[PDB]
C-alpha cells in the first residue's frame with residue numbers, strides 16, 4: 001500500500017494523477033488559486049534529482065483526497081512539468097525551515 005508517503009500521509013498513484021490533472025489544467029489556462037498562487041514555478045533550489053525536464057510547477061495534494069481549490073495547502077506537493085509529466089512528490093513535513101524532503 002501507499003505509492004507515496006509524505007510524513008504519515010499515504011497517497012496512491014491515483015491520488016497523485018488526480019492532483020496533477022487539476023494542477024496542470026490551471027497551468028495551461030493560465031489560472032491560479034490560493035494565497036500563494038498555485039500552481040507556481042518550482043525553482044528546485046535543493047537540486048532534487050528529477051528525471052523529467054524543467055520547467056517545474058508546485059501544486060498541493062491534500063490528504064483528505066480533495067483537489068486543491070484555494071484553501072490551506074498543507075505540507076504535501078506534486079511537482080510536474082509543462083509536458084504534463086510527474087517530476088516527483090515532496091513535502092514540508094520533516095524538513096527544517098522552508099525546505100522540502102522527498103516523499104518515500
Ligand SMILES: Nc1nc2c(ncn2[C@@H]2O[C@H](CO)[C@@H](O)[C@H]2OP(=O)(O)O)c(=O)[nH]1
Pocket residue numbers: 036040041042043044045046098099100
Ligand atoms: N521552498 C521552496 N520554495 C520555492 C521553490 N521554488 C519556488 N518556491 C517559491 O516560489 C517563489 C519564487 O521562486 C519563492 O520565493 C518561494 O516562495 P514561498 O516560500 O513563498 O513558497 C523551491 O524550490 N523551494
Ligand SMILES: [Ca+2]
Pocket residue numbers: 036
Ligand atoms: Ca511554498
